[PDB]
Amino acid sequence: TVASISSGPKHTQKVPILTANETGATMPVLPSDSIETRTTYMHFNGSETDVECFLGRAACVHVTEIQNKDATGIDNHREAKLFNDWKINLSSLVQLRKKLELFTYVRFDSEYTILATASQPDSANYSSNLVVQAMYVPPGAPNPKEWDDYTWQSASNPSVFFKVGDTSRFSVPYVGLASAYNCFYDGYSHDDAETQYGITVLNHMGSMAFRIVNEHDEHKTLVKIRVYHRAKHVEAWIPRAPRALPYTSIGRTNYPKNTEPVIKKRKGDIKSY
């Protein structure tokens, strides 16, 4: 492939460099339309800018935490982090979010990876070996209440059991209602005068539930869960302007008030170098 062809002096009536940008086109002008060039080859394919590659590496999408401790006398397991759910979403952490929102609709399979590490912040004789259970409680399913509900039987709901310190990995097909995931949605769930606005009203993929299967030892053990997400088989439509201001909420486009100028001011003139 040639990156530049050889081109010499020109004295024409045919001027490729004068255009009318009002038309909305970006005319494909090249170095050889306005200087004299020599042949050179590309030596490159643009492999690593493919959208599959761009969205295809694992990104941290969520960090939560649960603890193993005596539940005796706990009136609210959920509240003691005896167990914890995660109303699943990808808008939480901003790194991957800015990348996805370069597109309007996106479609891809997900390959999640869950790392769990334990901490024992206060005096323990040892480090116990805990098994985590991660169970996907899709919408319309019983929601745990206690850390050892009938729920956790999860006879019809996919669940994975792995050890703290290890990692669990499993992918799931693209479970969108539509043909693709909306990255934006300028609508409502119905014509209500007070119903929410935006994506949130589409993001309804349930929540992920985590718990330790082990009963309690004499000390307490903090287990912190990190969920990583990798898109595989990516398809993206309609590019948009990149995010400039900071994010404030999962699912709304809102930016913070009295934010700071995002364009760097010159130290000098327009004329400055």
């Binding site: 045919k14 494909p28 590659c53 399979d109 595989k232 088989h233």
Partner: protein, 40 residues
């Protein structure tokens, strides 16, 4: 070799090697030729 039955379980896809910027760079209704005048 796929070891698994479902398609979601296969590895990453392989390069589009599609590439056609004209839907974005030249969505004009009447074709523009480089070198010919923009507005006639």
């Amino acid at each position: 070799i796929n070891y698994y039955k479902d398609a979601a379980s296969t590895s990453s896809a392989g390069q589009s090697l599609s590439m056609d910027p004209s839907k974005f760079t030249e969505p004009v209704k009447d074709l523009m030729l480089k070198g010919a005048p923009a507005l006639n």
